[PDB]
């Protein structure tokens, strides 16, 4: 009985983690579009400034293009992928919290066609039928919510260690291929500016 | 005369486009804000659903530190550096935009001082030597201020092609040895990952 009031409390914490990473993983991917725009800026008043050409700007306007491809493409990939994980792993939650309330609801009413158990212990046969018919409904339903929630909060509950896990093996792995690559960028940017000073 | 004109051309442009350098330089550092405070939400969630301590806790919170030392002393760096060298080199232009200004009304005052020769094209003698020490002392005026801007406009001009690579120059670098150095810090973090899943 108490068992799954362990459940719901495992199942209301595990959506509030989640929302959490959802929010913090918007927050992540909105600043990624605030540096990806700001640098295209800083890259764009350098072609201002190099009129007419001078020293390699084929060699400024490629690295400058490829960094825009880099941001462009990294920032997609987070959107695409563990971002849209993370939301249909929360569109999971609303209807198993719709059908929680639906079986504590579904409780009360077994419980009050049970405790109408006065009825045979006086008796009126057409009553206690009656009754039964209204009892045995009242369990069929109760089990139906019951059975299936008993199975699906902790097999929801058991996910949750390794989907955090992927989550953030796949960002870290995409960070990774994205500033190991960029390193490269900006080094040829610098080896360009060399050149010229 | 219009030579003059052409360098003042040449220092209201140069000025504009160091004050753009500084905005687009100020939003680069603001977004880089953005992005190590966005990325240490993502790392603090992560120290959240990770309790009691599994698979290598003090390999993600030493990632975790190490990252927001890189973040941090990257924008510190272009703070106390290119900014600052830029903020000091636009600290010239107030005082030479007073002077422009300057010149240009002892230029009226010699010019008006000069046209009185009218005088001397009647005369009386008192009044011809007044007007020659107004005229002497309105081009000694005039010169003062005219000899200096001449020399200085087409000297920071000069300055300005090497100001504009040596900035990009240095943030390049900065940038490619905090993405060359963070790149592997999160390779750590996928590589504590793969070991729990
Ligand atoms: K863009
Ligand atoms: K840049
Ligand atoms: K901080
Ligand atoms: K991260």
């Given at each position: 009985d108490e068992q799954f009031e362990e459940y719901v409390q495992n199942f209301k914490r595990q959506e509030?983690?989640?929302?959490?990473?959802?929010?913090?993983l918007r927050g992540?991917?909105?600043?990624?579009?605030?540096?990806?725009?700001?640098?295209?800026?800083?890259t764009e008043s350098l072609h201002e400034v190099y009129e007419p050409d001078w020293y390699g700007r084929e060699d400024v306007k490629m690295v400058g293009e490829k960094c825009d491809?880099?941001?462009?493409?990294?920032?997609?990939?987070?959107?695409?992928?563990?971002?849209l994980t993370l939301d249909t792993y929360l569109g999971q939650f609303p209807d198993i919290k719709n059908r929680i309330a639906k079986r504590s609801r579904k409780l009360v009413d077994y419980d009050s066609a049970r405790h109408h158990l006065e009825a045979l212990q006086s008796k009126d046969?057409?009553?206690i039928s009656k009754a039964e018919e209204e009892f045995?409904?009242?369990?069929?339903?109760?089990?139906?919510?019951?059975?299936?929630?008993?199975?699906?909060?902790p097999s929801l509950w058991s996910r949750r260690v390794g989907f955090y896990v992927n989550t953030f093996k796949?960002?870290?792995?995409?960070?990774?291929?994205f500033h190991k690559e960029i390193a490269v960028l900006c080094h040829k940017l610098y080896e360009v500016?060399?050149?010229?000073?």
């Amino acid at each position: 009985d108490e068992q799954f009031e362990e459940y719901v409390q495992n199942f209301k914490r595990q959506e509030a983690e989640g929302t959490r990473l959802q929010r913090e993983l918007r927050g992540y991917l909105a600043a990624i579009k605030g540096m990806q725009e700001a640098s295209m800026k800083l890259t764009e008043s350098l072609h201002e400034v190099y009129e007419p050409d001078w020293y390699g700007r084929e060699d400024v306007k490629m690295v400058g293009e490829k960094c825009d491809v880099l941001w462009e493409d990294f920032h997609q990939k987070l959107v695409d992928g563990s971002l849209l994980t993370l939301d249909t792993y929360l569109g999971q939650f609303p209807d198993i919290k719709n059908r929680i309330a639906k079986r504590s609801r579904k409780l009360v009413d077994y419980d009050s066609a049970r405790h109408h158990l006065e009825a045979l212990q006086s008796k009126d046969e057409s009553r206690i039928s009656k009754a039964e018919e209204e009892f045995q409904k009242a369990q069929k339903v109760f089990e139906e919510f019951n059975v299936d929630l008993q199975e699906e909060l902790p097999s929801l509950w058991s996910r949750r260690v390794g989907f955090y896990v992927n989550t953030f093996k796949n960002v870290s792995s995409l960070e990774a291929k994205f500033h190991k690559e960029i390193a490269v960028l900006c080094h040829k940017l610098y080896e360009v500016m060399t050149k010229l000073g």
